[PDB]
Curated annotation (Swiss-Prot), chains A, B:
Quaternary context: 3CL-PRO exists as monomer and homodimer. Only the homodimer shows catalytic activity. Interacts with host FBXO22; this interaction promotes the proteasomal degradation of nsp5.
Residue numbers on the Cytoplasmic membrane side: 1-304
Catalytic-site annotation from UniProt: H41 (for 3cl-pro activity), C145 (nucleophile)
Catalytic activity, reaction form: TSAVLQ-|-SGFRK-NH2 and SGVTFQ-|-GKFKK the two peptides corresponding to the two self-cleavage sites of the SARS 3C-like proteinase are the two most reactive peptide substrates. The enzyme exhibits a strong preference for substrates containing Gln at P1 position and Leu at P2 position
Domain Peptidase C30: 1-304
Boundaries of the shown chain within the full protein: 3264 to 3567 of 7096
Ways its activity is controlled: Inhibited by pyridone-containing alpha-ketoamides compounds 13a and 13b. In turn, alpha-ketoamide 13b (tert-butyl (1-((S)-1-(((S)-4-(benzylamino)-3,4-dioxo-1-((S)-2-oxopyrrolidin-3-yl)butan-2-yl)amino)-3-cyclopropyl-1-oxopropan-2-yl)-2-oxo-1,2-dihydropyridin-3-yl)carbamate) inhibits SARS-CoV-2 replication in human lung cells. Inhibited ex vivo by michael acceptor inhibitor N3. Inhibited ex vivo by compound 11a and 11b.
Record protein name field: 3C-like proteinase nsp5
Documented effect of changing C145A: Complete loss of 3C-like proteinase nsp5 cleavage
Function: Cleaves the C-terminus of replicase polyprotein at 11 sites. Recognizes substrates containing the core sequence [ILMVF]-Q-|-[SGACN]. Cleaves and inactivates human TRMT1, preventing tRNA guanine(26)-dimethylation of tRNAs. May cleave human NLRP1 in lung epithelial cells, thereby activating the NLRP1 inflammasome pathway. May cleave human GSDMD, triggering alternative GSDME-mediated epithelial cell death upon activation of the NLRP1 inflammasome, which may enhance the release interleukins 1B, 6, 16 and 18. Also able to bind an ADP-ribose-1''-phosphate (ADRP).
Cross-link for Glycyl lysine isopeptide (Lys-Gly) (interchain with G-Cter in ubiquitin), residue positions: K5, K90
Cellular localization per UniProt: Host cytoplasm; Host Golgi apparatus; Host nucleus
Length: 304, 304
């Protein structure tokens, strides 16, 4: 037993991380089959980033302006293309370490693993959530850009995130692997608003179920409530409204614990109104919203 | 910028995880060169675990009673040996994926990555600390036993932990890769006391420095203090006493932030006496003690 923020094992993604250099700028790319994927702002200087015309900047670049390195192997670029905010560099070699993979666009509130990379070398792995406002709260230093977010289903890596920028507010924005930003963000060094973040209510509930399963039961109260009444209290506390879709997704946890979703909601209501009174749940003094119901079931039943 | 509990990339260890079966019992082993390492209690039934004589139980076992499987490849066992609480199975094949490695015994308060495994297949990776009382607060379901803890220095994997048991209290105990338990624990299903856990004071301080670096400065106070006076307050709050060795280890963070270790101690003192007043530091409502100063520098300077 026990409960931990667990990332996916990163081996399959490690073998895909390359170093991409165009003029002075170096960042991470992802080498799958005969294509390398990286942030298009690899073609920008510091000054370019103030107001980039990517089409005009890219037009000054030939295949040979792009230095792609996999460990000590330099790859040869035989084609380049801009797809939204990503560059696709066609290289002459299929990555021998290409895992089975999909590109997917994830939903606000879903989680994924990030392999934080510098100079195309992996430094570490952590789990996080796409916030409702489509930011992530990562750890990304200079040259982490092009570090990827992913999920694993058995043998298949589902890439969902590529890191492009830190906002002036210290949170992180990037794209799917087709180069569409999550959220209203652009790849430009300008002031950009994330907008109000909300708690992922369905995730918090998932974690309360995880807590019950690991014997942390003190917050279980004698009340119940209604979906409408709950959402009325959620609204006050900048919690995302809970839908019947959400109630359904929690069913298997309802079934394991013999606790009805609506009673767990009433428990949540009282924590929101009363705080924690200086107690902890699963080692935390605040309500945790970075586990999906799927993550909780995974860890509680031990999927590989 | 930003700050996250980051594990090491797990690829090098993934390629070493095998499935070990002896009679009915299956758990994880670690395949390095021509040796497989696993918990010796793989030779125990449920009933054996109540009061095992491992020497007598092991004597009923030949090389052929041990089914070692690496993916679909079954390995051949040509030798078996008990070293303390681990079994060393000599197999005919050197693991082609053997990384450069060391076995190391870590100190209370040091951190490492766990690759949580089921049936010799990796399920996930998280970072944790050896507690002063030599337990870990993991996530380990049935058959996770033999899952390993490690650190990585560039190309070299330093294995420091093998999971053997959950205590009746829900925390986790295991051994180094020579099979010596961390702490007073034995591989027997009996009541065993962990003893009082204490906070890793040097780690908390490291994290306060991390907090300052990421602009979380509100807890910085107008006081200072003495090492003796600080430790007097530490003792009351079950914080580990701070030594000059610890002061020294924090030097580079002192140097980056222009904040003297003793002034950061005075900050800590007031948090310990006053709590957090319902504020957060780096997203947490409690004082975090699972980052070493080394971990903080790693993440703040981006080592690969
Ligand atoms: Se970047
Ligand atoms: Se075990």
């Amino acid at each position: 037993s026990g409960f931990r923020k667990m990332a996916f094992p990163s081996g399959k993604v490690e073998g895909c991380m390359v170093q991409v250099t165009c003029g002075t700028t170096t960042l991470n790319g992802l080498w799958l089959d005969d294509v390398v994927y990286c942030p298009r702002h690899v073609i920008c200087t510091s000054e370019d980033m103030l107001n980039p015309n990517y089409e005009d900047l890219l037009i000054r670049k030939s295949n040979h302006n792009f230095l792609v390195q996999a460990g000590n192997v330099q790859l040869r670029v035989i084609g380049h293309s801009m797809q939204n905010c990503v560059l696709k560099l066609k290289v002459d070699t299929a990555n021998p370490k290409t895992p089975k993979y999909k590109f997917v666009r994830i939903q606000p509130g879903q989680t994924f693993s990030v392999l934080a990379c510098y100079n195309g070398s992996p430094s570490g792995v952590y789990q996080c959530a796409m916030r409702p406002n489509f930011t992530i709260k990562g750890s990304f230093l200079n040259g982490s850009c092009g570090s990827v977010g992913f999920n694993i289903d058995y043998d298949c890596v589902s890439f969902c995130y590529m890191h492009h920028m830190e906002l002036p507010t210290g949170v992180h924005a990037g794209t799917d692997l087709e180069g569409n930003f999550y959220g209203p963000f652009v790849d430009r060094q300008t002031a950009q608003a994330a907008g109000t973040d909300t708690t992922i209510t369905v995730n918090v509930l998932a974690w309360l179920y995880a807590a019950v399963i690991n014997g942390d039961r003190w917050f279980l109260n004698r009340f119940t409530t209604t979906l409408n009444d709950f959402n009325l209290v959620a609204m006050k506390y900048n919690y995302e409204p809970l839908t019947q879709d959400h109630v359904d997704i929690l069913g298997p946890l309802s079934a394991q614990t013999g606790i009805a979703v609506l009673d767990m909601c009433a428990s949540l209501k009282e924590l929101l109104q009363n705080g924690m009174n200086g107690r902890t749940i699963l080692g935390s003094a605040l309500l945790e919203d970075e586990f999906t119901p799927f993550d909780v079931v995974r860890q509680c039943s031990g999927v590989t």
